Amino acid sequence: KVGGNYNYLYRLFRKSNLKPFERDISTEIYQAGNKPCNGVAGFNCYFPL
Amino acid sequence: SWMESEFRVYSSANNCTFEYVSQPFLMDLEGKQGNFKNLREFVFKNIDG
Incomplete structure (x- = not known):
């Protein structure tokens, strides 16, 4: 669309590379910092999708 | 010696598209x-999905 089609999502962060022919639709908050990611969002806590 | 019908193993389900209702495996x-x-002898393996 001219405004932009935002109906498509793709994973960006994962713990490790997956094996071939696998599916992972899990949603969570990746540990991207020393401080543990409690929830919601914030600095050093990246949402993968 | 009357006991059967336990059922209700799970609580809820979600999106899934795999169903393989078929003839049972084990025969007594x-x-x-x-x-x-x-x-009874059974072995299970998982490679390439």
Whole structure:
């Protein structure tokens, strides 16, 4: 669309590379910092999708 | 010696598109005169999905 089609999502962060022919639709908050990611969002806590 | 119908193993379900209702796996051969039992053997492996 001219405004932009935002109906498509793709994973960006994962713990490790997956094996071939696998599916992972899990949603969570990746540990991207020393401080543990409690929830919601914030600095050093990246949402993968 | 009356016991059956436990059911309700799970609580809720979600998106999934795999159903393989079919003929059962294990068959219990008749055991008679004692000292006569069948040893069920099963092995499961998971490679390339």
